[PDB]
Design a protein around this ligand. Structure first.
Ligand SMILES: Nc1ncnc2c1ncn2[C@@H]1O[C@H](CSCC[C@H](N)C(=O)O)[C@@H](O)[C@H]1O
Ligand SMILES: Nc1ncnc2c1ncn2[C@@H]1O[C@H](CSCC[C@H](N)C(=O)O)[C@@H](O)[C@H]1O
Ligand code: NA
Ligand code: NA
Lengths: 282, 371, 282, 371
RNA sequence: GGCCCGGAUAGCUCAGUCGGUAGAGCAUCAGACUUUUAAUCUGAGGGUCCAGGGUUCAAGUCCCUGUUCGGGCGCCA
RNA sequence: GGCCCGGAUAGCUCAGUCGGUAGAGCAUCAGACUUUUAAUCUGAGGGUCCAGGGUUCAAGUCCCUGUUCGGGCGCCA
């Protein structure tokens, strides 16, 4: 830790990310007296982790080893316990820039879900900004509050357990940005307008289905939102390999090898459409 | 027309395909089940089936409160009020399957609280697992190319089906052509070419090793009449051909196939030496550049050629070397991406974007060389 | 010509395709006494074209030259006079395979438009197949008939001037395949079913807007069509270039060049969604 | 808050952007028109404007029979009953523009026979050309990155805006960091980093030639306070630094900037030599491999780095060489594609798929070297 | 006499018969340098496509006219 | 005693601390070859992910249990 500032040394209470080879990782809460088993052996926190610097190669058991990495929202996103489907960093990167988030930004979010987007926002708006997030599911709301305390970011976030479509975000005319990830975002557009400052701000909604987008855009226009833009961002990831295609035998008595960037998957899926808009006075 | 014994066919379950030849009293596996095809006959293609002990039976072709939110839905793990043990019981008892679905629904405390969409989804997921329905369909390039790309993509050098379609079009494959093909795609490209030529014209297949692979080709169930214009010629003799420097009871059977294959090779060699072919299609595991630089000599001017490669880099070289050699025009290095869609009320969106793992194409037209 | 069979030599009445450098092309109708001007000079048909073989380098005027190519549907698609927006060969390739078109196929099409798809179908279904196409615009219908006669493919195609959504395709239970490119294809689904053989066949509709697709899919399901699949195919085209990135100056006293396949355009557009379906008895 | 003189701003018309600094009595061009910015002041951002002789005026923010088919619509060319000459007349007469639209509609014989959608489209196309509305907006990474990619992509090595977004996230750019950047993207990447750091922390910019380019950076209109933590250091002295082998009235003004710049260079050199940086961002016209292999030494363990390249091939090499050097983990070679959508009643579809011409990224985390 | 082709984006002017129009040059500005009513080298800033109309599905690789630069044929359409 | 990790797709059996699970081997079959109740080389055919349940938006890089293979800690949770 912290999620919000880099520290050299691992300490108790920290969330540490272990790299296990390939891309595989696991998140661990560092406690004295605690043990963590990996395919490379056991880690005893009190001697193998605590006091040691992030980025170190840590020997485990029978000469096995792992690397320990400092926590970040991106690493957390890939290791957090899902209580919902979550947004990944490719969508989050675009959301963050297009909402114009920066230190000092005040942001409204619903639904909190599993906090993947929440941690990214907090990292971005700290130390002066604040996140007002909303989750109508009691347990998910409380689990999010617990994590925020564990990760020492409670200062920057308030979770309200309520229906954003009926009761809104719990604040009025304070936000620079609103982010929606819920099944019926068109029912929250008016509350988004009320949550954003009178001077204006930015809006973004994430929907898997085009009919949800359509309803959202219709509601945005009717309420006075402008600069409507609907986008989709698609990640492609490449393996770096050397390949050699054998020369054909034509009976004779160039075909040199090459480096290639081959996609890791033959198909890239759909996460959601991202609809952006702007609120301006007038 | 209708299904008959001996017919080459394709089995379909959901979007999964498997091709097989029908045979009385033969056992085959498909998606974790054991069949007997005997029963599926005299039925139209597109006809459905269900499995039993080991035999298939013909089923008909064709066959409300809910919540709004999940805000109060908790995962206790105890929503389904019947056990993992009970479940096998209903199955071993050999019950329908649809009734098992109905039973699972009735014993789901949360089902009624779920959204309509979540209900639909819950049911579709159960039907998929318990109401296993097998459709029998006719082989076609469409079905076989989709099947291979899904089932054995390594055998066809990861040539996606939309890519194969581009090759047939870019190469102006049609009835009457004299075509040359070099393929290590199990004979799938050959079969696709044969479908679009309809028994009219000729195809000369250059093969590596001891013979051409035609396993995929056999799945099409072509009439014998399509074989008359089908020739083969060993790739390792090609260099000779371009220079003109080219030449108890079963020990007999061999000699019979050897001279007969030698015979066919000479016919093929003659057709090639005319150097008047209407096109060239290449799709193999081998580096394409030398294949192209040699095989183009067999092709007449103002004719299209298409080279497939799983990788882009070799086509970049092939492009440059074709430009050194000359004799080509309108060179085009291309790739297709393919996106599929779920289209349902209030639930429409893209599913997969197939990209980068479906191959690349280098195409153009031949022209007269400068002299 | 012909569009349907390769011929060695150019003759009068032929549609010839001139390649002018780069990718640029122009289609010409070869007539005795006719002249064609290009950026490379004049071509006098009676001596420069007629009698000469396709694929030849033809000198024009002041030592300028062009190549003359044999006509094909793909080349025609890129050189035909637009009377409508047309489909290009990437969509046509997929349509052709997924409709399972082959020699002997009987096909119904609407709308004829500018005949880009029509010529591809004819090339595919000849010599035994037949195309029944429908165009409710009088002039476009007649222009299509003229072209079919000029290109000597009238044997394989019948154009009917009528509304496919009211009067259907003009045939019943004869077709192996139906292709739709019109604004309201859901109104032609019943007629598509009636046009396809009783034993069954294939269906495809091309729509730019997702709401058109939705209506089509709903109508297909209601009428008894099965195996519904909606696809989109996107062409990417690459320039082959050698590039060299200059080495940075770090004060010192590898960065070798490379071949790259760079896209010709930074953005690939949307033509249309392609919805396929199957008709089976039952 | 509200617009003021001296403010750096961005002009917007449709989706076209141009950034400019407001100045009393200065003339600027935008989309084929001549302006005077004097009039746009005291207005909120997002406020609209129209042009006149040379001055802008504030307009309000906001402001039926038809056929079914085109089966009988013929292109005679004579649908518009007013001439190409008449048209200039209405314009030279300096008429509103909306009335010219209304006039064109009234003199279109076919307009009433067109579909509603075709009508809407006809009107939008006319409004675009005659009702030129200019909105003034506040600079942000979003707006400037979109502008540059559209207006001057060659200046930023064709780095698309979604790609820039990935870099900021993958590099965990945030307040408090000590960041290192080497950019020949006009200072756009620097500006983006400065926006996300909010004046907290430090940035060390390595520059080629005689100084860092910050033209784009200036468009952001950052407070002077953001400059205190902004350092620069010449790239050609980096090798020395890693080895430790590193050292009338205007002729005075120069000496004043030279020693002051020498001063700042030494501070920057010190911060670098601590080798404890929180990340590294590279995006330039130069081959990236040597930049990475050298500049990483300045970065602390367990820190993210991101390298941009317009081309993939050099990142393939950089990947292999990073794996030889060691000291890195979770290496990822990536690219983003971006699709935009038209979302309107009964007229929804994708517009453009931005692919391949927006660049590639190689990212990972630093780790401790083996000893 | 007319006809047929091909071009117009940066303040100005250009851009290839490989399916080469976000690629440049001039000029301007800045650094460095010395030769200073300034030169030289290096680099930077500057791009949304000539106007108007008509048409295609609710996606233009669409058409016509005008302005202007250029190429070609020949008194023929 | 228990606890913690990681694996199950082809008839069978495997698959790497580089963000390596459509990649193979065995066996089988075929060609070629000679050494022939057969050997050898080459090649081909064979793939949709262990079962069951619960959950996420109307997109899983989600969770639990059972079966079975393996790794580790230690009588502690
Ligand atoms: N009307 C409403 N008010 C508050 N929360 C709602 C809501 N409708 C749906 N939700 C919540 O929205 C969440 C959607 S999942 C959100 C995931 C989140 N973006 C992440 O990355 O972690 C669910 O937890 C659901 O409980
Ligand atoms: N109901 C209808 N009946 C017949 N033709 C129709 C029709 N609705 C639209 N059309 C015609 O459909 C055509 C659509 S453009 C078709 C282009 C064609 N696919 C090509 O590639 O050349 C138009 O010419 C239009 O006149
Ligand atoms: Na100009
Ligand atoms: Na197995």
């Amino acid at each position: 830790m912290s999620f919000v500032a880099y520290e050299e040394l691992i300490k108790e209470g920290d969330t540490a990310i272990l790299s296990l080879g390939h891309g595989a990782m696991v998140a661990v809460r560092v406690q004295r007296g605690a043990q963590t088993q990996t395919r490379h052996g056991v880690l005893r926190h009190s001697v193998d982790l605590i006091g040691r610097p992030f980025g170190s190669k840590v020997t485990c058991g029978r000469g096995g080893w792992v690397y320990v990495l400092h926590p970040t929202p991106e690493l957390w996103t890939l290791n957090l316990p899902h209580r919902t489907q979550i947004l990944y960093s490719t969508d989050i990167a675009l959301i963050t820039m297009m909402l114009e988030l920066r230190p000092g930004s005040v942001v409204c979010e619903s639904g909190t879900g599993s906090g993947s987007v929440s941690h990214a926002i907090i990292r971005t708006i700290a130390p002066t900004g604040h996140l007002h997030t909303v989750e109508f599911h009691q347990q998910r709301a409380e689990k999010a509050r617990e994590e925020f305390q564990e990760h020492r970011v409670g200062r920057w976030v308030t979770v309200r357990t309520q229906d954003v479509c009926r009761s809104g975000f719990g604040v009025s005319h304070v936000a620079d940005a609103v982010f929606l990830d819920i099944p019926s975002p068109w029912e929250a557009v008016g509350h988004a307008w009320d949550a954003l400052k009178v001077e204006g701000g930015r809006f973004c909604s994430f929907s898997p289905c085009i009919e949800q987008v359509q309803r959202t855009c219709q509601a945005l226009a009717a309420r006075g939102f402008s600069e409507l833009s609907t986008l989709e961002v698609l990640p492609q990831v490449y393996n770096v390999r050397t390949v050699s295609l054998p020369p054909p035998d034509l009976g004779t008595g160039d075909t040199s090898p090459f480096r290639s960037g081959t996609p890791m998957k033959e198909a890239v899926g759909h996460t959601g459409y991202l609809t952006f808009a702007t609120k301006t006075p007038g | 027309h209708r299904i008959r014994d001996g017919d080459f066919v394709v089995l379909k379950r959901e979007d999964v395909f498997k091709a097989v030849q029908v045979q009385r009293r033969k056992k085959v596996t498909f998606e974790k089940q054991w069949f007997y095809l005997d029963n599926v006959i005299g039925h139209s293609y597109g006809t459905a089936f269900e499995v039993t002990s080991g035999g298939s039976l013909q089923p008909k072709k064709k066959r409300k409160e809910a919540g709004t939110d999940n805000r109060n839905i908790v995962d206790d793990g105890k929503s389904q009020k019947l056990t993992q043990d009970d479940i096998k019981a209903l199955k071993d008892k050999g019950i329908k399957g649809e009734e098992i679905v109905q039973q699972l629904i009735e014993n789901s405390t949360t089902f009624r609280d779920k959204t309509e969409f979540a209900q639909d989804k819950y049911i579709k997921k159960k039907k998929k697992k318990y109401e296993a329905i097998i459709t029998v369909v006719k082989p076609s390039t469409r079905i076989l190319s989709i099947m291979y790309y899904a089932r054995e993509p390594g055998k066809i050098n990861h040539m996606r089906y939309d890519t194969l379609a581009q090759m047939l079009t870019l190469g102006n494959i049609r009835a009457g052509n004299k075509m040359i093909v070099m393929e290590t795609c199990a004979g799938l490209v050959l079969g696709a070419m044969m479908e679009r030529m309809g028994g009219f014209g000729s195809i000369i297949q250059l093969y590596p090793g001891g013979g051409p692979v035609r396993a995929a080709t056999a799945c099409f169930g072509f009439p014998k009449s399509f074989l008359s214009g089908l020739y083969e010629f060993p790739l390792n003799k090609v260099d000779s051909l371009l220079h003109g420097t080219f030449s108890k009871d079963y020990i007999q059977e061999k000699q019979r196939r050897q001279e007969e294959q030698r015979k066919r090779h000479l016919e093929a060699a003659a057709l090639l030496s005319e150097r008047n072919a209407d096109g060239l299609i290449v799709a193999s595991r081998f580096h394409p550049t030398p294949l192209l630089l040699s095989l183009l000599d067999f092709v007449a001017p103002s004719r299209p050629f298409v080279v497939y490669c799983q990788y882009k880099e070799p086509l970049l070289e092939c492009y440059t070397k074709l430009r050194e050699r000359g004799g080509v025009i309108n060179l085009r290095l291309s790739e297709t991406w393919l996106r599929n869609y779920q289209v349902l009320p209030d639930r429409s969106h893209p599913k997969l974007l197939m990209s980068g793992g479906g191959g690349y194409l280098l195409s153009g037209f031949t022209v007269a060389m400068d002299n």
